[PDB]
Design a protein around this nucleic acid. Sequence first.
RNA 1: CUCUUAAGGUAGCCAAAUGCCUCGUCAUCUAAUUAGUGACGCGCAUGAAUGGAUUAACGAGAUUCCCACUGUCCCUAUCUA
RNA 2: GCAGUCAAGCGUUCAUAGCGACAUUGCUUUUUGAUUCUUCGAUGUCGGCUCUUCCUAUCAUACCGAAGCAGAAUUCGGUAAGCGUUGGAUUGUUCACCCACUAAUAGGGAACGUGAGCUGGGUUUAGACCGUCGUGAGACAGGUUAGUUUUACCCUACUGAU
Lengths: 224, 136, 52, 325, 141
Amino acid sequence: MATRTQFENSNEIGVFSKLTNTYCLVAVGGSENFYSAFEAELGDAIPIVHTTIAGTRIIGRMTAGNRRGLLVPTQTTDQELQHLRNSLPDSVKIQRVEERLSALGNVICCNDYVALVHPDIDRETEELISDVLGVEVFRQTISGNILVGSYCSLSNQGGLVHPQTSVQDQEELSSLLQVPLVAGTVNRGSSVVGAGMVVNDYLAVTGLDTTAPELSVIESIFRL
Amino acid sequence: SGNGAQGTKFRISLGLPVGAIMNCADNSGARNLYIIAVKGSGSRLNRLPAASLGDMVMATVKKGKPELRKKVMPAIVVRQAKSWRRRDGVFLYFEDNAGVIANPKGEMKGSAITGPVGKECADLWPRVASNSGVVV
Amino acid sequence: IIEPSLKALASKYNCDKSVCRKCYARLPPRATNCRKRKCGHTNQLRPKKKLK
Amino acid sequence: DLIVPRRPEWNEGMSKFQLDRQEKEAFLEWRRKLAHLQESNEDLLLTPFERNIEVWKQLWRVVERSDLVVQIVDARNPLLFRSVDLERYVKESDDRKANLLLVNKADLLTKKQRIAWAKYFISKNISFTFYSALRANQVMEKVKILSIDINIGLVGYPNVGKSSTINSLVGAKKVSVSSTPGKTKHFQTIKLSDSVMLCDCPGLVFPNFAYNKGELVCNGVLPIDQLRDYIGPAGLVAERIPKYYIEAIYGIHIQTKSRDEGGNGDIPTAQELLVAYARARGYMTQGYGSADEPRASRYILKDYVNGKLLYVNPPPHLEDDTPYT
Amino acid sequence: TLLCCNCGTPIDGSTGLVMCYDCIKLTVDITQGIPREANISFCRNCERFLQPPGQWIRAELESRELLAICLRRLKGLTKVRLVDASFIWTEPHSRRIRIKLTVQGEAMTNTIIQQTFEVEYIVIAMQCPDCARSYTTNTWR
RNA sequence: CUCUUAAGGUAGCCAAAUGCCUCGUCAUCUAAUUAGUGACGCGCAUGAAUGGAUUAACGAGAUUCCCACUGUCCCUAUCUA
RNA sequence: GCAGUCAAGCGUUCAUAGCGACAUUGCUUUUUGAUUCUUCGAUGUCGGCUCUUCCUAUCAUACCGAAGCAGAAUUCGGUAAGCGUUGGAUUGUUCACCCACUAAUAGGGAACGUGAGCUGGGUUUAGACCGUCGUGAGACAGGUUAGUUUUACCCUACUGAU
Ligand SMILES: [Zn+2]
Ligand SMILES: [Zn+2]
Ligand SMILES: [Zn+2]
């Protein structure tokens, strides 16, 4: 359900958090109502993890993982990797990618069966992603906005893109992923969609400034 | 200093002061930024105020897109050359001073950032992380 | 909810006073002249603006 | 529809204060007309009119005694210089009238392409005559004839040579010719030969409804100095005059239009054309070294109007390449 | 294929755009911080007016330079890219001078909008103090 | 027609080293310009060998701007005789 | 320049929440004057830069009072001068007018602070050009350019040292 919250006072929860059907991630930001965006909406289904990777707080725009595996960047360290290992289940794998880029959550956009990757990624990461996730990868574009982990959110049953995406590109991505999508905004006209929110099989989280004509289309496109 | 600046920073050594002409890393059509003033930035006689990494500036464009120049605009510096210190002790520095154009509330105007970005800026302005390809 | 049986009690201590037009002091209603030596203990008072 | 008001009822009398009050009322009425026309089309199509009652009062004294006039119209674009509400105005009194409009400034177009405008009128029953402005300077059985072809007068848009064609009679410059069109004012009268007599027109303009936004109206109508735009009217300088002629005269190489997509395309618009020119001419800003192109617009445009660069308009409709240099 | 984000129904194009034309006209605005009524002073005897600090403009009634002095009258109109501020007719007797103004604004994210908004300049007669001071004589230079 | 004992600023040109009012008006240059460039001129009081205007070249002449440059400055520090 | 008393009235009704003419009692020496007491055997004369201190008639900051103070934002006043009160284009400028940041960009004085501390852009010599006047030399507090800024080793004061 579209549960609206604020991390500290910003609305981009896809920046400071992360969500999938095996683990949930959150930065150290207080404001216990934010943590109640998943402590209340779940039982003991999946574990929440309070982390600050690389001495940072933007875990969503630095980690691009999946239901069955995770990509953590090179700048991080074993001290923040070991908690992310121990307090998570062993059905999912954690691996420091040793590649040039760092902001995985703005070059990768992936769900449990399909993916979308930046065009100029190393061909070693091109294979490591499938070695650790077994997911198929399609590195062309979104609309010319080569950054994909910010202008695209993905469930398995629904995704979303930004307004300037062409009528040709929305149908191209529909054909690629075999999942519908809409050229929807988030948080009152902010087109950074994959960072202004996050979604899962049943759960959606957006900003407290977000509006009802966007909650209503989120509830349609992402759920079923 | 909280005009969209989410967190709160330590001191980063002030490399580029006013009168500086730093590149523009974003795809707004611009090419450079002439810094005129800095936010916060208290006063002292004959001290000209400076900008550190991750800070906001009021700035002006000199080269590119006549639609843009001849008016001031908020900007966000994301690369500098004066070597500063992370509290881990190691010192770092870039090769070029570079920034981004933004609105007063720290939100972006461009679609990307052509180049790397500082960790002190990404964690501080969150919308920069929503467009950053590389963080250092 | 104030239950104005207690609003009377409060207004006795907040909105039952008189103000010197020259000193801007909090003085009792019945008082003719001010309290302080700053104002020469003048008599120019007024009620406190409790209504509208 | 209407571009000049009516002027009746002098009636050989008195009351100076009132027989011009009736003209003040004839302006309250003609003025009401322009406001309704502007309100009638969309909401904004700014025309070059005049609100000063005195300049129109002046023109209300240079015809009734002038009694036979000749219309000077630039041959760069008579489509927007042809006056419309004069044949319906200077006829009714049944006295000495009949403008018999002309076209002039007629030596910057070539020989055979001048029939392009000679034929525009033989179909629609309009009078005319080709005679120049600067070059003479002391129905098919005619090609072109000099100045050989009771008051008289003359009228212009602004800048027709109402001070430069006064040499059509004597040629000694008793009115000063200027670069700006705003100098002509306070009507003038010239007199010679004891039976013919002139009445020179003060400065005028005449509004329009067509070619108002994306035009080229700034061809002979307005000053070039105090123009805050410097891009719009230059945008139709960047359209005609192909690149490989301007490339050959001033002798510079601007670019090759790497924006060959649909943002700019080909035949560059006036943003990529002037950037590699002020860098080659040396004019830079005051605070930073960059191309001060709006100060290059004022220069290249001043050569477009004075006679270094040329373009005439084919008469009646859309044609691709009628004029050739 | 998007939805307005305010009212839901109007689907807008992917040319770069924001919530509906209805809501962007109604709720959103770029013309606040200006009074629609601008008081100015005038002198009948010398037929010429001033800005409140400044030398008398000396320009006539219904002149081009009225645009300039009216723009100099301090509003926020000098912020947003004005264009085509010509005049609309008012009855001369009615002591009102109306200007039509057009700003081009920046929406939430890089989408530009036209505008059609109006302002009236109201004139009040003066006692012409400085010209009158010249008439008076307290000292000689 | 004339008035002043003769004539009545022609060509040209400008807030220019000549313009009190003057930080003249407009445009442009700048984030912002009493400066600067162009244009406008009833020009307090421009003007034709008391020479006018325009001029390539030249200048330890006066002035504005820009690329480069730099301890001129931010903000000082250090070395030598 | 600053402040006070009357209160004719403005202030949606509401003199004095704020304001407030008709009049009137004062305060100041940071304005311009007036006078000529000191200095004509010369007190080195504009501004800026650098630097210290003091004043309150407080712009900000602290605790407060008072409103036509619901909250927010503001106005009036008091104790109060302990700590701060800017970078910049234009101008030689004092003055000013803008741009921008800021808690704020308050006003002032110490021979109109400070030239054996600086600079010399200016005024105020001699060279020289233009305009007006003058027959003329020449005049202009009208405009423009160029034009030497001297000495401390003595007493006191101060910083430091025996
Ligand atoms: Zn009292
Ligand atoms: Zn709508
Ligand atoms: Zn007057």
